[model samples]
Target: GHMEDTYIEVDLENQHMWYYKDGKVALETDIVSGKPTTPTPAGVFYVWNKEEDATLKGTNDDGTPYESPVNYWMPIDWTGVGIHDSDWQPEYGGDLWKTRGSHGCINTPPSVMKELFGMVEKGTPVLVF
Candidate 1:
């Protein structure tokens, strides 16, 4: 009988990330999502898992191989699409995801990643839309 559900709301069109805690707005910032050809799917999902540090391996846009280390990794599913800090992107905002973006993950800022890592937990509801 209370407001107990916490969730993350992402506005893909605006490239914004809003973290709701105790059903209140805790954090809000810009983020980079998937590229056009490899667009990030819009849907509702739970924070399936998370990692403090890890190496991300995937295929590049030109069919090349790519492997990089990430500070925070929060995946939504087993398909490898997730949220993490971006070392390659110098800034966050706008429609950069259309031309230059991750394969199918959200690239968060260092501060955003740190905030989420500390507060967000596994199984927290995530909405990408």
Candidate 2:
């Protein structure tokens, strides 16, 4: 019984992501975003998909999954943007946030993902600025 509705905010310059519930802060974490050459798109987006036990496999350039994380998935926009756990690498290294490490989606820790999965639903607000 998940009662909380989640909202996400991503600060590209700060490389920080925050999740909120009922106007209160639920969680905050470092996130990796696209490189400056291919920056993450800015604007409001809605959650289009939510996968509890999702798996991704290699696919060609026809917009397919490849080397994806095995966890919750939330596709936010048409530009292939979303938020999920960083199964590949969860460390923040020397930086306090992750920047230019992710393709476009926000990379959070597994624990954060579990919390977020229970808080969010389809069509939730996902604001990336």
**Candidate that would win on lDDT:** 1
Candidate 1 residues lying further than 4 Å off, grouped into runs, are 1-5, 60-65
Cα lDDT of model 2 overall?
0.62
Put down candidate 1 lDDT per residue, 99-119, tens digits, no spaces.
666666777787787887667
43-115 per-residue lDDT for model 2 (tens digits): 7766788865675333323445545564877778666577676667565322333343455666666677677
Q: What is the lDDT of residue 31 in candidate 1?
A: 80
Question: All candidates' TM-scores?
Answer: 0.83, 0.74
Q: Pick the candidate with the highest TM-score.
A: 1
Count clashes in each candidate, considering only residues at least 3 apart in sequence or on different chains.
0, 0
Among residues 3 or more apart in sequence or in different chains, the pairs in candidate 2 whose N, CA or C atoms overlap within 3 Å are none
